[PDB]
Symmetry: D2
């Protein structure tokens, strides 16, 4: 049983609580799209873990690679270069758009956003950062100052020069220009305000192409392009955080490829590592050159470490061969349609959005009012669990709870249909 | 050859420069205390990589463990608990001193210091942090605000409430109380100043037991104890950063065990992972309880991930069995004596300090004046390389260049004597 | 002549330039609504100096009072109390609304706003201040951090916790709620944003009832009342800056009396001193009590100084007897109608707003587009001068230049008609 | 009686408490070196009010001048120039040292320091300010961030970039260089620390030549000169706050004349106004030129106002003719010797320091230990009052209470001897 009293004793006495609440089970092993409890029960992993397991759990190629390297090249002194590093950096250069040339290999998502934000502050000579009011960029220092979806209170003052703008949200429009939702004019209205408060030191803007934690909020048409143009006019860099969206998850290698807007700095994470701690920043030669002349510094213990780099190369080799970026669109369409059927069935589902395998279902009390369904989401989530479907819900102010759906890129037709079922039952039994 | 033009082409075109300068070689494989270039040449790794490879490179047990886990349990959703995590947390509870009860498993050194600093700001209700003027705590946001050895200019303003005090330095004493170096009175003098600038929100103090980047600066006798008492009187927490010192490196499990002063939060990193990206924070139940009631949040992608935790448990199992903490003292004494012989031989060596396998040699122009030897250090370092000894030098203002010596805990008698030789030759041929 | 070369020599060699540009004349003497140059030429003072000379220049009663006191009671030690001080404090208590009980007598406008902002930060235990994006609160430290109409760039970072919201502007509406300008919904939209960025330390809001520097922008109907309610809900104080509006200028003793919303702290200045350096803050006993228990401190050289207090009492005695608050409405209506006639005559006049003797004329290229008239304003201002009418124009982004009209409360029917003429001629001859 | 119950009622109900405690008396009139209560009792004003009444109270020339101007030229629009202003600016240029060329006329002490600090931040392009740990520069925003003697807690965070250094204190030496108090080495030690924390944006240093609030702490020999040199090396401006020291009070026009070190910006206040609200900043043409090109702005209601300027010119004309700067040295020597006699008599007096008519007596328990006399100071102060001597005591941490003695420059031989007596009696009757 998952009930092992010694286990839970030790967990209650020696683990620090960092947010949420531990599942009441012991994960014993994982494979593909499933995780197994102590009882042998398979739970269908519909969130790719913490939105990272792009190739699923324990993908045979990742196992080989970790193998070949653990006993060959593990960790090196920060100044020593090695093959996996140079190959990964190069590979990233070729698959990202033209304009993205040099990478820096690191460990976490927030570490990558910090490195990005520090290079832009160096390069520009300024320090003000702007982000969306429902963003998620990390727990560490600067990543946490541009984060607005959560953890903003009780921990002291934020970094100086921190500003936020509202994210364009179609589901629940708020800004209106002559009859309809004018997200571009909201953008201009927002920027006018920033401009009025800036002390003259705008340095960059970080943006998620799709706000994950913020409730799977997809940036509307023509938005990025217009955002990039606001940055251009002020001398600001545009950092795109593709931590949940890069590596095929939305039907393109990088979400920035859809819109056709290449950022100044692109940050990768979750999906790059496929479950491991790997991360990177990709930038243009021009910026890198400039950062180098001014003395840019981002030295860590794990920057350029063989193992991880080696893993990341494989992730990309697999994605490439197996053409998982296309699977993402196909499977992605399969999951979406089903979701919409569910919607036909139940009034609680108020919206289904996202792209490829990065979908979002917004639970609501009633479509007309579009009133948030208080605790119905927790029910659904509890029910899912009992049936063996691991989901995740995010809940923000003025919104209904949103389920984040992000199955592996390697999900099967069956697994998809399965989850779609469990989801149905859980919802049925929850009202 | 290490000369492979395609390699270097790609490295020159696609890598971001983050500090220092890449070695002009290609590391092909690593094992034990050596790294091998493209030519098959073995370079004796006298810095344990980036001061992490406590068990050396590719330690057979670490290879097994990475193996058993890559294909079993890799990465899980942040709320799911698993065995390696609970066992590691528990193990840490038992080996750290009484008073340290609950841990939080993470990925990097700076991530761990951030989590520590955020919990202290939560717990206390304040935000001012004090650190040494020659500290190294990380590149990320808050870790970078308490860092003073480097990267402090050109990247904007630091976090609000940042203060520093001078570290006690015996080698080059500066504060004098009636005839001699009064480090305790320096401490009091320093704290009076802080107290005069504080806005009334002192929350914590981060301190390295031995300042690594700051030139292997060991905190003198009775210092910690007195520091802890300054914190106690003001309501401040004491966070000890044992990133380079924990896990036996100085002859004790944790350096804090020597002085007999248990901190409020203890942070681990480099040596915990033994080369991998693992890190943690260890705290008292009382603080954890309190942080939990106030809503403490430190959610990342890799917090509580099977693989890494699993690795870390092994590191500690090995250390424990092979009694590497004692080897550290024995080998540690062997290296030290030799270093002192060198000192007899050459006038440039102005000081040899540190503890166990975490030694420091301070190059100087002449013992009397104790004048820093300008670029002689670079010579020595260049010469070492040619002979196959990988060393590392740090150079700060008002100091001579300091070689950081930190061979693996598994170093042999031979390897030690060998390095000691190469070191001699390199120094001989450099003047 | 005003041309005196020795004069201008000395002025060019020894005066620091602080903004704008010195008039090319020497004011030799002043009386009533006029100032006289070196040539004896009378210039009709249509701005009451720097919007302060509520009783005009050299009002016989102010001359007596300054007389009786200069040789009797001048300046005292900050702890010594005297009659003029206690009487002024009391008088202010009786004429301000119920709820405003205790005053603090000071010297300048920005000094008063600082004292207000520091008491609110003390009282609340927080530090975030919110103000309008086109506000003017002063040059000193905190007053300057809540100022947004100007001087915001090139002088370093602003105080931490500084935020701004757009002021409701009817002339050039920007926020739209279903067909029309919804200033209340703009308010809510604005506050949602603040709420999203706050670190949980909102302490107060400073607001001008009518934004003077911001282009005579009158806060629309039901606005204050709704603003006060936003503050109430968050635990924030409301500080009203009646520096240009208090003391009858808008047809009420205090502008806050119109709306019927009493602030938490009310700040007075310009009009209180009638040209001298006097200022004050008026607060509720409850807040004062509380500030006192927590150790509130605002000690200056001139706090509670006989002379000034004495002057201020007279200003108020005169206003009261001569019923200048009513004259303000009557004369105020006379000036307004004329202004509107002008408007009929010339297309450049795009709007005439304000209240009582605190009017604003917005120069524009053409009513339809409502395009700002580039430099036509400077013409008009130059022409006025030549004809002997002293005016003042403010020009902000996205607006046309606005003439601030604020003649003394003692202005005559004739003087008004006169100015109205000169104004006509100047405008006629300027296009 | 001073007891008038209506008075005290009104004072208890309508005055805001700003620090200290009101004297329990009603000052009815003042003249020369005395203030008179309601009972007609003359109290000898030994603090020149709030250290401002350099010519005493109600000096016949100041009365004429206030007279000639109140009914002639009072307050003008900020862009209009007038004679008293240009003459005052010029006069200041001629009497200050070579190198100080252009002035800006304002109202208060803290307003002047703000204007100074904002010009240095503009001119340099940086924002860090350094001051002494026992300084007093004002209550307003930036003046308050460089103030360290008091009001530093409970009102939120200070301005970013605020640092302090210890003031050189001979009475209670703390830094020691080989046997003795090495204030210059303290200076260097201090600056090394600043340098280690600076983010690379040091802009200026504000310093009082003699720390008044800090306990009449005179900057030791060769100090200023060395301070100025520390600023020179870093690109920092030196602002001297001569608010209590300028205008002859220490035996020179300006204290900076003693040391022979001309500052970059000199700030005047208290003594310039002689009791009124006048203040100014004096700077070099080079800085002014530069500030002007970059858009320097310091526009207030009272900048360049006839009345005050007019007063200030007279203050200086009187000082000049009556040769009060010399009287200051003569009377100054008379008061000092007497003080020292007192010292012979009573063991409580532990030190008598200062210069000219700006003296300080440090009450202590016993000369050997130099232990601060707890509440003996309050006794002495209470006793003085009863005898009719108005004194003032400041009390800081680690110090004994210090009496600030600063009689008018016009004090008579008799008045001096008188005070010296009362002082004796008060001290006698207090132990
Ligand atoms: C997960 C995530 C991060 C941070 O990654 P970590 O590994 O947790 O530091 C940053 N940004 C976004 C948008 C993320 O989704
Ligand atoms: C290496 C180090 C760190 C940071 O570890 P990273 O993995 O680089 O983030 C922090 N503190 C000390 C004292 C270190 O030596
Ligand atoms: C003029 C003014 C002030 C400042 O008064 P000063 O005497 O210049 O410091 C502050 N607020 C408003 C709204 C003003 O119009
Ligand atoms: C009194 C004083 C001030 C401030 O003058 P205020 O008129 O109170 O603003 C500033 N600095 C020093 C050194 C002072 O003594
Ligand atoms: Rb590395
Ligand atoms: Rb590219
Ligand atoms: Rb995890
Ligand atoms: Rb323990
Ligand atoms: Rb006073
Ligand atoms: Rb009232
Ligand atoms: Rb003026
Ligand atoms: Rb001069």
């Amino acid at each position: 049983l998952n009930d092992d009293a010694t286990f839970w004793r030790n967990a209650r006495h020696h683990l620090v609580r960092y947010g949420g609440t531990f599942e009441p089970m012991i994960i014993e092993r994982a494979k593909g799209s499933f995780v197994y409890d102590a009882d042998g029960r398979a739970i269908l992993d519909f969130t790719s873990g913490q939105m990272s397991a792009v190739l699923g759990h324990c993908h045979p190629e990742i196992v080989s690679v970790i193998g070949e390297y653990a006993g060959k090249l593990d960790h090196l002194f920060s100044g020593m270069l090695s093959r996996p590093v140079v190959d990964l950096a190069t590979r990233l250069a070729n698959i990202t758009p033209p304009g993205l040339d040099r990478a820096l290999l690191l460990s976490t998502g927030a570490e990558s956003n910090e490195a990005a934000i520090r290079m832009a502050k160096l390069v520009t000579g300024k320090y003000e950062i702007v982000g969306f009011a429902q963003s998620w960029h990390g727990m560490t220092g600067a990543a946490a100052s541009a984060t607005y979806s959560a953890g903003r209170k009780g921990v002291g003052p934020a970094a100086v020069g921190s500003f936020a703008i509202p994210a364009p949200f179609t589901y629940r429009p708020r800004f209106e220009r002559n009859g309809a939702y004018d997200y571009l004019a909201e953008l201009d209205y927002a920027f006018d305000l920033i401009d009025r408060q800036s002390s003259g030191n705008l340095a960059a803007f970080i943006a998620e192409p799709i706000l994950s934690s913020g409730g799977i909020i997809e940036l509307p048409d023509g938005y990025m392009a217009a955002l990039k143009r606001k940055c251009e006019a002020r001398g600001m860099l545009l950092i795109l955080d593709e931590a949940q969206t890069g590596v095929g998850r939305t039907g393109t290698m990088f979400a920035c490829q859809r819109d056709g807007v290449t950022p100044d700095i692109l940050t990768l994470s979750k999906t790059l590592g496929a479950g491991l701690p790997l991360a990177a920043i990709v930038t243009s030669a021009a910026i890198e050159e400039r950062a180098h002349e001014l003395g840019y510094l981002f030295y860590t213990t794990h920057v350029s470490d063989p193992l991880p780099a080696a893993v990341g190369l494989r992730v990309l080799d697999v994605v490439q061969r197996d053409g998982l970026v296309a699977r993402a669109n196909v499977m992605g369409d399969r999951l979406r349609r089903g979701l919409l059927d569910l919607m036909e069935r139940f009034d609680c589902i108020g919206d289904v959005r996202g792209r490829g395998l990065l979908l979002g279902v917004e639970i609501v009390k009633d479509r007309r009012t579009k009133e948030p369904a208080d605790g119905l989401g927790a029910k659904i989530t509890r029910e899912c669990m009992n049936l063996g479907l691991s989901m995740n819900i995010v809940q923000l102010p003025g919104m209904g709870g949103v389920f984040r759906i992000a199955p592996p890129l390697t999900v099967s037709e069956d697994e998809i249909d399965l989850g779609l079922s469990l989801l149905g039952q859980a919802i049925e039994r929850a009202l």
